[PDB]
Design a protein around this ligand. Structure first.
Ligand SMILES: [Co+2]
Ligand SMILES: [Co+2]
Ligand SMILES: [Co+2]
Ligand SMILES: [Co+2]
Ligand SMILES: [Co+2]
Lengths: 105, 106, 107, 106, 108
């Protein structure tokens, strides 16, 4: 597939909606790293993703639990998710950075 | 191969059974991360998966050992398991979250 | 796609694990995923080794992971495939140490 | 596809440009690890990559947050990016090292 | 699918590792999996580097991992493939540091 860089920043009041325009193209979001930004203090941060499960209902899943003094970056190794996907902070002020690839076949 | 989002929550008194209707061989659970929940205490948490070995018997294996002050998240990198699978906390009260993909072959 | 079965074992000082497959027409691989310390392990260094054949036709020993409860209780290997036979053991530390992975069989 | 080793060192005010090559081959940069170098201090380091998004515009993303006393190395597992790519330290003085593979389809 | 053999080496301030082959280098890949501090390693910074050919055809040195016993004694590289010849060495620290991985061989 074609491969484009993806990223976003999450905050307590800022989520991210990944949606792709309808067309003759199949899209995947492949998540790589979740990293705490400066401004996360030392509070617990939990990042969640919401998208469709196999049985056709939205589910919310926890991608990572981070804390600056313990584990500031988690590497997901290319966690692919079919859009639409919402990414949000379940707790923590943020910022939390997300990186990955937007794959198009 | 279609790809759907998967996750579950585990607690001391709550496991998770991943099962599929008919063609178990066309389905794979691909585990990504095991994460401690908000509200988990700082005790040792150990997560276990139970599924079939080649010899045809269920076996119990340890997926991850976590502790809030040391390692609150473990990334498994797409550990595929053929259903049925049971996921449970062997140790700790949780909540512990698991995320991954439910992959379906065509 | 190969068939995929679950694999795991527990290691202790003086308790290793021999993974071997019976003869057949198929190709087998052991794909190692995680190494994790178990409850009650001493908070000391644990070193896990794997033994299997090298390219030159001799069994060799390699270190898969170094773990310690208060620092790094789990290491994820990401699917380290090894052709059987494989012997897994603790080179040091009390254990218990758990290993998980997949037994892949291509027909 | 041919496989070549790639690496760079980043510092404050010292970034890296992985440039479109002057050939008609297909190229990918696949990032493997980001690691703090000797002499890096214990401040937060944030490493960023800039490259083209799906819509055609350049974007800046965070690859890793590192701190010597907590997490001196992050493994990305083969994060492929299409050139051109700029790698830089957003925060921290470094040195920070990046390693990976230059993949070429000829 | 390539033949898949086990690979490992030990590094020390004392000792590096040269991975080389006598036949066609392009049929071989070293796929690195883990870098781990050994028993006997102290708590100083350890930095492991690899040296191998870049696209332009000259040798380049890269850092594979930075380890410290009290912080991060093992780094998993997830199958970092390199074409021989390759040299692995400690740039910093006295070790021992162990490396494990796969030696992959293309079948003609
Ligand atoms: Co919203
Ligand atoms: Co049950
Ligand atoms: Co034995
Ligand atoms: Co510049
Ligand atoms: Co030498």
């Amino acid at each position: 597939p074609q491969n484009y860089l993806f990223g976003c920043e999450l905050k307590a009041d800022k989520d991210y909606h990944f949606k792709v325009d309808n067309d003759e193209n199949e899209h995947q979001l492949s998540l790589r790293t979740v990293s705490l930004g400066a401004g996360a203090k030392d509070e617990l941060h939990i990042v969640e993703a919401e998208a469709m499960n196999y049985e056709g209902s939205p589910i919310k899943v926890t991608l990572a639990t981070l804390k600056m003094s313990v584990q500031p970056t988690v590497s997901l190794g290319g966690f692919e998710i079919t859009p639409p996907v919402v990414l949000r902070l379940k707790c923590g002020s943020g910022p939390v950075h997300i990186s990955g690839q937007h794959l198009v076949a």
